[PDB]
Write a protein that binds this ligand. Structure first.
Ligand code: HEM
Length: 116
């Protein structure tokens, strides 16, 4: 997708998320009520240290799942529907209460390029 446009679309994510490199460099200074999204491409779902996730997203990483750009793009359009489908569980719940109407792919490409 497009990284430069996804950078501008991350203005919907920064209200709960930041993007902080391991030495502390703040690539995006945002909030702290969602987890750090630096290196989230390729990382096991629900394992970022010192963050209390809801149980479904943890069970999703406990089965082997690591995020990809394409899964980020779909999850961000409707996080609770994503979780219900992958876990095959109607009761799957999510704490991320925000659905991105368009721009999933671009934000996803922007998150992969930020470590690079
Ligand atoms: C399009 C913008 C956003 C993107 C790209 C995004 C991306 C993500 C991703 C990729 C995860 C899973 C992280 C992991 O497994 O470590 C996540 C989790 C989460 N996000 Fe977002 N997020 C966005 C907007 C938001 C907003 C606006 C909020 C708050 C209103 C939010 C709150 C959270 C929370 C609380 C979690 C943990 C989910 C859980 O425990 O169920 N996110 N987000």
């Amino acid at each position: 997708g497009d990284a430069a446009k996804g950078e501008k679309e991350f203005n919907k994510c920064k209200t709960c998320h930041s993007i902080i490199a391991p030495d502390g460099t703040e690539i995006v200074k945002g909030a702290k009520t969602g987890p750090n999204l630096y290196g989230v491409v390729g990382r096991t779902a629900g394992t970022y240290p010192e963050f209390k996730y809801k149980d479904s997203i943890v069970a999703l990483g406990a089965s082997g799942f690591a995020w990809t750009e394409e899964d980020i793009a779909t999850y961000v359009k409707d996080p609770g529907a994503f979780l219900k489908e992958k876990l095959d569980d109607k009761k799957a719940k999510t704490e991320m209460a925000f659905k991105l109407a368009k721009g999933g792919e671009d934000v996803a490409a922007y998150l992969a390029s930020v470590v690079k």
